[PDB]
Amino acid sequence: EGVEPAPWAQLEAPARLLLQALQAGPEGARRGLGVLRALGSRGWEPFDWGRLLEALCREEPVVQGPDGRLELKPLLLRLPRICQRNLMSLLMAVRPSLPESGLLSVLQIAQQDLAPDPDAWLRALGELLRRDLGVGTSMEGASPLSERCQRQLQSLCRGLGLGGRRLKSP
Amino acid sequence: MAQDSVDLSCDYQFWMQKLSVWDQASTLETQQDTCLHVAQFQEFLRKMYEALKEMDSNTVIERFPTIGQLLAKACWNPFILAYDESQKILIWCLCCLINKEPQNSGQSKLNSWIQGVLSHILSALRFDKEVALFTQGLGYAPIDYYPGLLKNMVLSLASELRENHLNGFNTQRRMAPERVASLSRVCVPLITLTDVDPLVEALLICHGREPQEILQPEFFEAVNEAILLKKISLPMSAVVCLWLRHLPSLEKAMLHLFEKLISSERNCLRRIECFIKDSSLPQAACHPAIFRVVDEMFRCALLETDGALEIIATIQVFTQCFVEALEKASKQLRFALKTYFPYTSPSLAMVLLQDPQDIPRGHWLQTLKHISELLREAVEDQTHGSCGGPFESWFLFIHFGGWAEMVAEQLLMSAAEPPTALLWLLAFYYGPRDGRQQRAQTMVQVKAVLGHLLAMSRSSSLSAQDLQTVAGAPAQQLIRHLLLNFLLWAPGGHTIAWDVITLMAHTAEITHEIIGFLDQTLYRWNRLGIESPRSEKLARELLKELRTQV
Amino acid sequence: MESLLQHLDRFSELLAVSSTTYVSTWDPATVRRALQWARYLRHIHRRFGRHGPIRTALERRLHNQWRQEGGFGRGPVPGLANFQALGHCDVLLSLRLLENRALGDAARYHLVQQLFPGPGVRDADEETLQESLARLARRRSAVHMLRFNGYRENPNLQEDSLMKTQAELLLERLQEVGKAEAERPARFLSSLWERLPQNNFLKVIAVALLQPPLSGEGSQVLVHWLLGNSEVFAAFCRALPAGLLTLVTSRHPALSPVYLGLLTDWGQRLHYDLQKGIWVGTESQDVPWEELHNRFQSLCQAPPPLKDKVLTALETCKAQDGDFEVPGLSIWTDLLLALR
Amino acid sequence: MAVTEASLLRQCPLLLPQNRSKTVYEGFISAQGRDFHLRIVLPEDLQLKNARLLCSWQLRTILSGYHRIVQQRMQHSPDLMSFMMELKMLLEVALKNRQELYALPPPPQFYSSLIEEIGTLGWDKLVYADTCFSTIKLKAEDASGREHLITLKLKAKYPAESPDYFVDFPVPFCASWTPQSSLISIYSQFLAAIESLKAFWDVMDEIDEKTWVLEPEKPPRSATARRIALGNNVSINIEVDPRHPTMLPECFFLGADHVVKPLGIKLSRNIHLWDPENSVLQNLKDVLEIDFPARAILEKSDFTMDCGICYAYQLDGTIPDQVCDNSQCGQPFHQICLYEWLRGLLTSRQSFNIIFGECPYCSKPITLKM
Ligand SMILES: [Zn+2]
Ligand SMILES: [Zn+2]
Known about the structure:
The structure is cut from a larger assembly and holds chains A, B, C and D. Chain A is mainly α. Chain A has helices at residues 13-22, 28-40, 49-55, 81-93, 100-111, 120-133, 147-157; strands at residues 60-63, 70-73.
C-alpha cells in the first residue's frame, strides 16, 4: 500500500549495494571504502563513477508540503540523508579519479541555491569540495560554516591577546 | 535594591499570557513553543521563588491576583513538570502560598486547592484505565511499578524504532513518521531523566530512509547542551551520528571548547586535554566530514587573532587526542591525510605524525632540519601540484606539538654555529608572510643575539640590563620567548628570573602569553619525558606567583 | 531480626491509618516519628537487605500479614507491597498523608516544610526524599506524555508494553505465594476471576505464558489452574485472537488437545443453509464460520508438533461424520477444503 | 498572459477547443520538439476533480510509471493551464530519463563527419562503438607500450557541444573544447596527459612486479593505494601523491601489535634518509632496513574471511560464519550483519526462524537460520 522500492532499485547493481551500504550509520563512509576495494577486487575492476554521477541528479517527481504540490528532486535530495553525508565524505576520499563535468552538476544541487529549509551539511560539503577542485573561492562569504558560527567566534577571539604573526596580507 | 516588582511584573504578564495559550499543550505547535521558552520560565521561577520565599501569603497581594491560575496552567502542563528543577520550584512556590492558621475562608480554600494540585502532580492515574483497575486489585501503588512501567514502555519504543531502521523499504509497518517526531518532542524536556537514555540513544541511531530531516533541531540543541554539561552520558556511537546530522550542534560543541581556552581555564592544558578526551571530539573527528567542519573553525579563530599562543596550545592538545583516537579504530580501511589535511603533500603530515617520545633526544635536530628543508621546498618553489602557498603549510605545522616547539630549545643547545635551517624554520613559526628580505634579516638579528647570550652563558651570573640591551618593532615575541627558553634552560637562570620578568611584563597580555608558554613547556616536557627538574620547578613557581599578579 | 518485627508492624499500622480520615490528633511529633521509623526501614533495606535470613523472615511476615488481612470483607488495604517497597516506604506514607483531605493544616505545614525546606540542602549525602518526589513527578509526566504521543496498542500482545507489565506483576505475586505456601495459588486466581475485569485479565495470562523465565513455575501454575477450571478456559479460547492461542499451544502442549476439543464441540453446533453459501449458528453466541476458519488456519500455520495433531484430529472427525468429499454435509469437509 | 484565454494559446499552441462551451480540447502538446495526441473532456463545468483525459499509445508508453502522478494532478490542480504546465514538464522529464530510445540526430552533419574524423585519426585507434553510436571508447599507447582507454559519450550535436570524456587515470583530465576542436583535439590532450604522468605509472608498475600487492587484484590505473604484504600476517598500505610520486607517502602497517612496533620506531628514526631521486622501493628498503617477499603466497593472496558488511573479524564474540552458496562469491557474513541487511530488502521473506533473500555481493539465494 505505502511500499516504496528503494530509489536506487533500478541502478547498476554495485552502486545499488554502495548506496544500501552508506545507509548504515556513520561508519557508512568506510563501508564505502571497503565496498570500493571489494569491487576493484571483482571482475568490474573500473567503477564508472560517470554512470553513477548523472543518476544522482536525474530528476523524478514528488507531491510534498500541501496535499498537492508537484516538485522535482534530483537523486541527491531524495535518497536517505545519511548516504548524502557519507557520499561527499567518500568523494573527498576519491576527488582526483572523477570527471569535473559530473561533479559540478552535483555541487550546484549541493550549494542548494534558493530553497527553504536547506541541507546545511551538504552545502558545507559543497564548499569543502569546490575549495578542493580550485573553482569556488567564489570571492564571497562562501566558507563552509554558518554566519552565526563565524560571528560568535569573532566575538570570542577579540577577548584574547592577538599575535605578532602577519596572516592577512593587505 | 530599587524595583523588586517592575521587570518581574512585565515578564509575569508575558508568561501568564504564554501559559494560558499552551494550557496542557495537547497539540504540536503549543508544545514546540513550550519546549523552547521553558528555560526562561525556569529562570523566571527561580527569581520569583526568591520573591515569594522572602515574604508570606494571605497578608500580601503583589502578584496574588492570578498566581494561582499561573501555577495551575504551569503544572497541568506536563512539558513544564518534565524540565529539570521547575517542578521542584513550583512545589517550593506552593509551600510559600500556604497559610498555617486560616482567618478568611479563602486562605483555607487555596490551601485545599494546593494539596489538590499536589495530588494531581504526584499521584493521579492519568493513563490506560484497565491497568489502573488491575494493579489496584493486585494492591500496588503507582509508585512501585511506574518505574518498571516506564522502562518496559521505553524499550518497547526503542525496539519499534530499531526495526523501522532494519526494514528499510519493506512492505511492513513503517512506524508513522509523525509519531517518530512526536516522541523526540517528548525526549527534550526529560533528556536528563535517567530512565530514557535507551530511547534517546535509539532515535539518534534509527535515522532510516527520508530525504528530509524528520526531527526538530530544538531536540538536537537540548541533547548537545546536556552532552557538554555532563547531564547525560550517552554511548560515543550516538554522538558521532548526532553531529553527523545537525550542524549547529557540531558548531556549538566547538565554541564550547573555545570558551574553556578563553574565559574560565586560561593556560591549564591538563584541563584542556581532559575536556577534549571527555567529549568525543577526537572520536568524532575520525570521520572526515567532522574533521573538516571543526578544522575550519580553528582556521577562522587563527585569523581573528593574529596567531594567538592560546589557540596554538588547544590545537596541539586536540591534534594529539585526534591522532591517538584515529590510530585506535583504524587497523583495516582508514581514510587518507589528503582527506583530513587536503591542502599539502601528505609527506609533511606523515613526517610530523612521527612522535618525539619514540626517537632519541639527539636525532630531533636531524628531524627539525629535515622539516625546514621540506617547508622551504613547498613554500619557496610555490608551483603547481603542491601546497597553494605558505599559510597552508603553516596551518599544518601548528597542529603538531613535538616539532614546532623544539626549535627554540635546540637553538640554545647549538647557539655555537646556529644552523640556517632552524633560523628559517623559527622566523617562519613566529612570522609567515615576511618576504626573504624580512626573514633573512630576522635570522641574522637572532644570530647576533645568540652571540651576546652565548657570551653571557659562558660568563658568570650577570645582570638583566645587559640582556634588555640585546632585547631592544616586528620581532619582539620571537626574541622574548627565545630568551625565556634561555632563562629556564641555562643554570645562570633561577637568580635574575624576576628581574627579567618585571622588564618584559609591560602589560597583562604578555604576562598571560608567558603563562601559556610555561604551561606549554611543562605539558610538552611531561609528555616527551625529558626534564631538567631545575627548569620545571622554577617555571612552575614563577607561573604560580605571576597568575596572582595577572 | 526480632528487634525489626515490633518496628515494622507498628509502621504498617501507621501506614494503613495514613489512608484514613481520623486526622485531628496528628501533630509534628507523630509526623517526625513516622519519617524517622521510615528512615530506619530505608536504612535496614541498605544495610542487611541483601542475602540474609532477615530478608526471607520479613517476607514470611509480609505474606502472613497480607494473607491474614486477605483483602476480603473488612477492608481491601493495599499496604507496603513487598521487599523493594521497604526502599521507598517513607514516600508511600507521605503521599497517603497528602491524599487525606482532613490532614490538619499545622501538620501539613510542618510536613511540607520538612519534605521541601527548599534548596538550602542542594548538598545532601543520601539520595534524599525531595529528589525522590521530584524524579517521581518527572516519571509520571514522562509516562503520561509517552502514552498520548508515542504509545501503540501492539497487535502481537506478547510484545505489548502495558500487558507485558501487568503480566510480570501477577507473576511476582504468584512466586511470593508459591514460596509462602499459606493458601494454594488456585484460591488467589479464583478471587481474581471473581473480583476484576475479566476481558482485560485474560490477555494478561496469555502474555504470562510466553514471558521467558526471570529467577516458569508461574506458567506451570496457570496451565494447572485453567485445566482445573474448564468454564473460564472456554471464555479464554473465545475472547482472544488466534496467533496468541497458537503460541500458547506450541509452548505449553498440555493445552492443545482440550482447545481442539472446544472447536470440535463448536463446529458440531453448525448447519449449512443452501440459499446463502455458509454455515451459521442457531444461537447468537455461537462462533461464526469466519472466526473458526481463522483459528484453525492459525493452528495449521504453526510448528509440525501441533500441525499433524490438529490435521489428524480433523480427518478423524470427518470420517466420523461420513467421509463425504463435497460440502453441504460435513462441517469438517468444509474446513479441510478451505485450508488448501 | 494572466487569463487562460491567451496564456493557454501561448503555452499550448496546438490544443483546440472543439465545443463552443470550451469543454472538449483535442490535438497536440509539445515536449522536446515532438507533438503528442491528447483528448481532454471536461464536465459541463471547469472541474478537473472529475474529467476524462485519453492518450495515444505513444503517450501512455512514455508516461509508464507516473500514472498515479497524473491521476493525482487531475484531482489536486486548480486550472487546466497549470495542469498542462505540470504535464509538459513531466513529459520533458520522462524523455530525458529514457534518453536511450529517442534520438533523431541530424545525419548529414553527424554520421558523415564522425566517419571523416575517425578516418583523420587512422583505424587502429577506436576500440568500441554502441549501435546507437552514443558511446565510443578509444585506445592510445605510451612510449613504454602501455594501452590506455577513454570513454566518450556523444550528444545529438557532437561538434556543437563538448563530448563527455570519461577516463581511468587518477588526476582530473581537463579538455580545451571549442566547436572548432574535434576528436583529434581531445585525443592530443589525452596523449599530453599520458606523457605527463609517466613517473607515477613507472612507480606503480615497479611495485606490482617486485612485490605482493594484496588488496587490489589486477589493479586499475586510478589506483594510488597498494596494500603490500611483507613477512607473514602483517601488511603495510601506502597511498602516493601523484604529481611527486617519488616523494614520501602516508604509510602505515596492519597486524600484530608486537610485530608492528619496531618497524614504526625504525621509520621514525630513518625517515630523514628518504630522498626523492631514487625509487619508493630503493628508499623503503634502506629506511625499513629490509627486503620484501615477491608473492610469498600468490594463489591464496587473501580471502577476506571478514563480515563483508562491516569488513571486521570479531563483532561482539560472533565470527564470519554465514556464507554464500555460490562458487563466485563465497563471501562470509555475520548472522547479525546479514539479518540486519536482509530485514530491509523487498525480495527476502521470513519463514519460522528462517529468512531467504539475496546475497549482497552476487544477488543469489542465501538462507539465514537464526
Ligand atoms: Zn559484521
Ligand atoms: Zn554471494
